[PDB]
Amino acid sequence: EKKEKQIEQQKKIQMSNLMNQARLKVLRARDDLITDLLNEAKQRLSKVVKDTTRYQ
Amino acid sequence: QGIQQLLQAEKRAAEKVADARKRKARRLKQAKEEAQMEVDQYRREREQEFQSKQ
Structure with a gap:
C-alpha cells in the first residue's frame, strides 16, 4: 500500500x-x-513615414 | 526384586516426559520455518503487484 x-x-x-x-x-x-500582428502594425506604420503628404 | 524393578518401571514413564518435550520442541520450530517460508506467497504478491504497476 506504500508502493x-x-x-x-x-x-x-x-x-x-x-x-x-x-x-x-x-x-x-x-x-x-499578437506579437507578429503588432509587428505587422509596426511595418505598416513605417509606410506612412514613406509618403510625405500623409506623414506631415 | 520389587523395589528395584519399580524404579525402572518409573524410568519408562521418565522417557514419556522427555518425549513430551520432544513433541513440542520440533513442532514449535518445524511449523515456524513453515511460517517463514510463507513469504514466498508474499514474494509472489510483490511480483504480481509489479505486473499491475507495469
Whole structure:
C-alpha cells in the first residue's frame, strides 16, 4: 500500500503536468499571433513615414 | 526384586516426559520455518503487484 499509493500519486502528477504544458503551449502560440500582428502594425506604420503628404 | 524393578518401571514413564518435550520442541520450530517460508506467497504478491504497476 506504500508502493501502490506513491506510484499513483506520481502517475496523477505526471498526467497533470502534461496538460499543464499543453495549456501554456496554446497560450504561448496565441501570444505569437499578437506579437507578429503588432509587428505587422509596426511595418505598416513605417509606410506612412514613406509618403510625405500623409506623414506631415 | 520389587523395589528395584519399580524404579525402572518409573524410568519408562521418565522417557514419556522427555518425549513430551520432544513433541513440542520440533513442532514449535518445524511449523515456524513453515511460517517463514510463507513469504514466498508474499514474494509472489510483490511480483504480481509489479505486473499491475507495469
